[PDB]
């Protein structure tokens, strides 16, 4: 009878959604049913912004057992998708970033999916005066060779320029200037630093020294750090001689004798 | 010096002196100079002066502007400090004579603002700072508030920098006009009044400057006098108190922020001195926590996360604009967003390389300091500007995360710290770094944090004590290994401990969500200890300690010395026992494990485990989880600290949805009358008080100030409903007839018979009306009666509501259940929770209710079968609840509907001819008199049948749930309408209630004056909010604020933080209207007068005033009340066989002799109770009884021989009270304990103590003078009862003037009775 009154209640609530959540609670608190729970969750998500949609989203992302979420889907990502859709612009009480971005940061296991959703959640949740730089620092820490960071930089540039069309307008102008200074040269350099680094590729070493020229010379120190303990396969003298010719432009006095004194005790087979 | 001060008091100011010499300022000057200043502020000397009534008799009444001096003001301040440290009223004398109080306060301010080390020393300045802190903490008294208003008002912003004041006016434009009005007011005052107003307005900043200069005066490593440290601590404490008070913080926050004292105290070497400045460091940390609290000083409302982030982003934006517009070197900092430079690391990296001049120019552009003149270098250290700018612009963590980052356990660095866990020897001269709760709080977060921290620190004392006891009994010695030379009951040597689970923590939080560990102990003890250890269950608090002893084996241990070095205390950590493992590897018909090993799973602190792991990873520390060698268990009744702290953390993590008319009331501010019934917009007009009033005369007399208008004129027509107006002092009284409940006359519902007075009637009415109702009930004022009447009225007027009953002990719950059992309350809706010896005639626990529900369901099924047989329905099948409902709705409802259509759509005969339940009611109907009567009788039979069907439908859940726990949950959640429990049980199971879904509409609490504040707040959040609002409809609390308060184990937390302050007492102190019961009904009026002076019109009920048993004198006793002065016995007065176990041999022996005489004369020894002021005195009386009576047949045993603190709520016919202390008055000075000790006697009270020491006590004088209105020597009648109390006795009046003479008389009487009688008890 309840299996006939609850569908009849959902069909009778087709003109006034007052008792629909109540019948859903009487069926979900008196019957374990994954398909009915998903139907009631879509029912409460058919509301304005978060009218009982947040409650069903929390009850669906809770996932104590493993039978209810596996009812009409099996991907282990629909709960994160629902948490991100709750992190969307809505009218819930707070539900700001905590559990959703927390879970999407610890057990993401999806390339550029949870990162972009977390950047957008910190972008527009409520004002985001400080959460914008939060998303920017999050993109600076985790990039994993993806273009979510540059998209977040474009979103950061967007709003101040849009507001102007003034200190925030200049902030957006500088942000776009940095995004243009984010040319794919650093991307190709990171590519040559990720994969061919352990491959003992001297070509990647020369590309890294080329991407670190003698004007950001701390980046020549980074190129020496790349020439540092991670060695190569029968070509370390060329890298060391490049570093020596670079330090010779650096006065030819400091860090010149010491490096050769270290190179006399680097007589290993590598 | 003591004899000199005593002679000075007796000559000039001592009470009990008819004539003293005239006032002399030289007396006060000499006293100050020789006793206070000479003795280095002797606490004993100050206490002697304060007890002698020095301020109330000589200083205050004789204070005048021409005679006020530094010595006089210092003596007044020291006396006030002594009164505050002693917890006695200190402002009564000032209120009696407020004439020179403004000049006194102005001179105190002038002295406190004196340049350091001048006319006033640093000790006098620290005492003055403490006095000013007490005064600012005394904001309830009008006289001090009218003087502190000028120094804590918005005009005090005249002490802030002009640029900062302009920035404030620009941020708050609406305040600017207000300031203008203030300036206009300054025009109207003469030069002297304007100068005084400016001095008061700048006093706060001047004291801040003096504190900053004193703080700079401390050397880094060089020797420094403690006076500067004590002054810095007191000044920080006063600042913290001011910052925690919204009335004091509102304008003081801006002055403190402009002063930058937090940056200085963070930059001073005093905080760098590990030994001298530790407590000062805790005070500065608390001051930072208060100065950064997320609350708007102007609006008073707590700031949300969005507002905090917006404020931080606006600060960052202003700093970036200033940098970009005035500093090229930080232009990139001006170009990059807030977060990129909003970390302390980014702020230091960008701003650290700049010069002190650049940071000074930034601080000038940021409105922090004066503009740096061109060509000038800054005079403040670069570190000062750097720390200021970083602390202003760096990211700050929330208070919720700060609380959630705290473990629930105190470790080895906290268990022994006297700065936060002060011992029982805390005198109160130094300060303690713990919050205090007196009147108000900033927000719900402030109150919850204060309560939780205070509870943790209070339990920490008992934890450290028990741990030291177990380790000292264990005998830990060296042998590189640790050898246990002894045994400990609650502590077992660690056989194994291994962390087996480190769960991944939920994201965002950086700590593991749950950490488990398996611990094996060696149950090589007596089988009693084996059972005591095996009795540990889930939720048990166990403590893992790792001790590396330093002393060789066999070295004696000293309890007086530091236990830490004595036993080698290394680490102390907590854990919660999850369960004992079996022989099947499962954490557990409990099984009987074999062998002497016991393995238990325990949950470790995830926050503390995270801290330990981080320390090991970063600083190379050793593994703290691999060094535990001992595990300690404790008493479960004293091991609930973790549960209360967890309830606090959760109730601080939820939205804390309390009633909209109760939030401000709890917060300590606003209108105290905003929760009354007359001020509630949802007040009910007509209310059914059917069983409240017994008769119409009692109803009319319950409202002397109301005119009763009855809806019926017939005096035979006067169950009554009362409708109130809203001329307007008329109550519409309507009599009613309770519907017939069947043909059984025994089924008529019982009625309450207690003839309530007008005050009880007003209290019951306020309880039946929405809002908060406070009942102040004297001892025996009928609190249980009014409570039961209110509960019955609420259940009867609102059957769809649920009542939550909250008590402090099981005795109040047993009494409330016994009182309810006499009223018309169905037992199927009442429920009793507890985790105990049955005190009631019925079982109100879950199991008793389940058995009763099952038995009633069986009876209902049998009655339904009988009704079916009487209706002629065939079928031998036994019916269940569902089938019972089906058969009802099929046959009984149908027949009732047909009969109703027949006779209710009309002859008196056909009403019975059409009755379908004649055979069903044949065991019991119709009279044939009138149609109405027969119709009502048939309706009553149908109502009984409907009640049977409703009870069956309600009990069907018992067939729906087979387990008893599920049945109890269903009865507690839905079936029950009134659920009762204790404050402790509620604080332990609040999470279980909220998770299971228990709901309630009305809350009734008794003994609220004995419940802790957190223990009174914890019942208000026992369920979730309803659609955004709290479901609570009425909050009634009944208690006695003049009675004993909640117990604080280590009295330091009460002396310093006032943790014993109950919620009811605080709500009364705010000014919340309460109804004071003024009619006692258990003890004689002559004895009740010994405490009725402390109650509001506490009188005597008619039964006690006319009852004969209250006018009969005590057999063998001249008067029903006598105070016995007991002088010294064999050269000793008070005694101390043990430290603090005070006894008095003469008084104890005299009580023993009085009990012996009362026993030999024919009085019932069980009707006599023995009370004493100390546990040692009670034990001395017990040993004396054991050595004097023993097996004597003519002398039995007393009902109770204990303390007054342990006899609360109890009483006897006759009470022998011992005031043994004779050197100091002591804890008897508490008016509540005195009222309790004088309000425990039913017919006779005999007190033995030093009359003179207490007569000099001012606080007990209202009882002491009435007690001294009779002789201090025992007037007895050994030749005897039927004597009247006032009629002169017809027997011999014997006057025993001493305890030895009383003992001699007792020996003679006993030797005569043993020869003249013979008892045969065997």
From Swiss-Prot, chain A:
As recorded in Swiss-Prot or TrEMBL, the protein's gene is named XAB2
Q: Name one GO biological process term.
A: blastocyst development
| Subunit (UniProt) | Associates with RNA polymerase II, the TCR-specific proteins CKN1/CSA and ERCC6/CSB, and XPA. Identified in the spliceosome C complex. Component of the XAB2 complex, a multimeric protein complex composed of XAB2, PRPF19, AQR, ZNF830, ISY1, and PPIE. Identified in a pentameric intron-binding (IB) complex composed of AQR, XAB2, ISY1, ZNF830 and PPIE that is incorporated into the spliceosome as a preassembled complex. The IB complex does not contain PRPF19.
Give the UniProt keywords, A-Z: Acetylation, DNA damage, DNA repair, mRNA processing, mRNA splicing, Nucleus, Phosphoprotein, Repeat, Spliceosome, Transcription
Show the GO cellular component annotation of the record: catalytic step 2 spliceosome; intracellular membrane-bounded organelle; membrane; nucleoplasm; nucleus; post-mRNA release spliceosomal complex; Prp19 complex; U2-type catalytic step 2 spliceosome
Judging by the UniProt lineage, the source's domain of life is Eukaryota
Localisation per UniProt entry? Nucleus
Origin species, per record, is Homo sapiens (Human)
What name is this protein filed under?
Pre-mRNA-splicing factor SYF1
Task: Mark the HAT repeats by their residue spans.
Answer: 17-49, 55-87, 92-125, 127-162, 211-249
Key word Aminoacyl-tRNA synthetase present: no
Tell me if Nucleotide-binding is a UniProt keyword of this record. Answer: no
Functionally, this protein is described as follows:
Involved in pre-mRNA splicing as component of the spliceosome. Involved in transcription-coupled repair (TCR), transcription and pre-mRNA splicing.
- Its main localization is nucleus
Q: Which residues carry this modification: N6-acetyllysine?
A: 262
What family does this belong to?
A: Belongs to the crooked-neck family.
Swiss-Prot record, chain B:
Which residues bind ATP per the record? 755, 760, 780-785
Q: Which UniProt keywords apply?
A: Acetylation, ATP-binding, Helicase, Hydrolase, mRNA processing, mRNA splicing, Nucleotide-binding, Nucleus, RNA-binding, Spliceosome
Query: What Pfam family is a match for this entry?
Result: Aquarius_N_3rd
Q: Which residues form a coiled coil?
A: none
What Enzyme Commission number(s) apply to this enzyme?
Answer: 3.6.4.13
One function term, GO molecular function aspect: ATP binding
The ranges of region (Helical region with structural similarity to ARM repeat domains) come to 1-398
What subcellular locations does the record give? Nucleus; Nucleus, Nucleoplasm
The GO biological-process annotations, alphabetized, read as:
mRNA splicing, via spliceosome
Q: Does the keyword Methyltransferase apply?
A: no
Q: Which parts of the sequence carry N6-acetyllysine? A: 995
What is the UniProt domain comment for this protein?
Contains an N-terminal domain with structural similarity to ARM repeat regions; this domain functions as a scaffold for protein-protein interactions, but is not required for RNA binding or for ATP-dependent RNA helicase activity.
The record describes its quaternary structure and partners as: Identified in the spliceosome C complex. Component of the XAB2 complex, a multimeric protein complex composed of XAB2, PRPF19, AQR, ZNF830, ISY1, and PPIE. Identified in a pentameric intron-binding (IB) complex composed of AQR, XAB2, ISY1, ZNF830 and PPIE that is incorporated into the spliceosome as a preassembled complex. The IB complex does not contain PRPF19. Within the spliceosome, interacts with SNRPA1, SF3B1, SF3B3, SF3A1 and SF3A2.
**Name of the protein in its database record:** RNA helicase aquarius
- Species whose genome carries this gene: Homo sapiens (Human)
Q: What is the lineage of its organism?
A: Eukaryota, Metazoa, Chordata, Craniata, Vertebrata
